[PDB]
């Protein structure tokens, strides 16, 4: 496909969350442009390219069992960008917990994620 | 006074309350002199306090517009944050709701440097 329409952005970002929930790092990486940037959490040095994005997320969604679900609709623009609210449930000190996140994504003219920012900090972690 | 993550949470929630009340001059006072507003994200940025003032005056011109958070503010440690909320208004003679995510960057004075409002007609619904 091409630069995603607003409806297409909603579908792509919803699919992304489904991939996080099942832990399919390979499929997440293929959603990214080969030269994408990830800032997760926003404020940390950017991660650059599919190899480093794969390595980074195999530390997480491979090491432990994690879940994720949208907590509201995907907001989508007409320039191939969108933003979504979601919640991640995981193990914290041998104790389940919840993290509230918003990802902002910009897609390229091939329908792949060019940039992603994940807004969250410990203020968004609850036990 | 580069807002901490907890201070960003308070600043962004305070902004939604000012929108809900509709105090346009109180809203504009939150922005820095050289701030930009992109709303909806994808449209050319607005800059200059009075242009920002006129923009809010046209949207909240009374004009029964309501706004409320629909999730917690996500906040970073570099003075930025993102929040999901819901706008209630009347359009086409129909009571409507609009789901939005705002992304904001604050300056070292605690004032809004950049605002980006993610939404489009895919986020419109009748109530
Ligand atoms: C202008 C408007 C009311 C104010 C909203 C705007 C959507 C974006 C938004 C985001 C803010 O941060 C301020 C309030 C406006 C609506 C789109 C249509 C509606 O009338």
Rounded to whole angstroms, the Cα distance separating A20 from A43 reads 21
φ, ψ for residue B52, nearest 5 deg: -60, -40
CA distance B40 to A82: 11
Of B2, B27, B3, B13, the closest CA to residue B82 belongs to B13
Q: Nearest C-alpha to atom 16 of ligand 1 is from which residue?
A: B59
Q: Is B107 flagged in the annotation as binding?
A: no
Is B5 in Cβ contact with A121 (below 8 Å)?
A: yes
Interface test with A, best of B11, B38, B75 (most A CBs within 10 A): B75
Structure tokens, A45: 């040095």
| β-bridge mates for residue B104, sequence order | B81, B115
| Structural resolution in Å | 1.7
B39 flagged as catalytic: yes
Q: Which position has the token pair 């449930």?
A: A89
Tokens of B41: 């994200």
Answer for the pair A56, A38: CB distance below 8 angstroms, yes or no: yes
Experimental method reported for this structure:
X-ray
* Alpha-carbon radius of gyration of chain A: 14
Task: State in Å: Cα B59 to ligand 1 middle.
Answer: 6
d(CA A18, CA A87): 12
B28, B100, B116: residue to mutate for ligand 1 pocket, most atoms within 8 A of CB:
B100
Q: Does B37 sit in the ligand 1 pocket, CB within 6 Å?
A: no
Q: From the CB of B85, is ligand 1 less than 6 Å away?
A: no
Token digits of residue B44 = 């050319």
The verdict on A120 touching B (C-beta cutoff 8 Å) is yes
Residue indicated by tokens 């970073």 = B76
CA A64 – CA A99 distance, rounded (Å): 15
Q: Do the strands A75-76 and A81-91 form a parallel or antiparallel pair, or are they unpaired?
A: antiparallel
CATH 3.10.450.50 fits A1-127, yes or no: yes
Please list the residues that pair with B102 across neighbouring strands: B83, B117
Q: For chain A, give every domain's residue range.
A: 1-127
Verify whether residue A16 is a known catalytic residue.
Answer: yes
Q: Does B65 sit in the ligand 1 pocket, CB within 6 Å?
A: yes
């Amino acid at each position: 496909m091409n630069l995603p329409t607003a409806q297409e952005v909603q579908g792509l970002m919803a699919r992304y969350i489904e991939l996080v929930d099942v832990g399919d790092i390979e499929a997440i990486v293929q959603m990214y442009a080969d030269d994408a940037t990830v800032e997760d959490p926003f404020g940390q040095p950017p991660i650059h390219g599919r190899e480093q994005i794969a390595a980074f997320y195999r530390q997480g969604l491979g090491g432990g069992k994690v879940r994720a679900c949208l907590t509201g609709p995907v907001r989508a623009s007409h320039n191939g960008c969108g933003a979504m609210p979601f919640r991640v449930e995981m193990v914290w000190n041998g104790q389940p917990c919840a993290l509230d996140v918003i990802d902002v994504m910009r897609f390229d003219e091939h329908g792949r994620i060019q940039t992603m920012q994940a807004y969250w900090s410990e203020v968004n972690l609850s036990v």
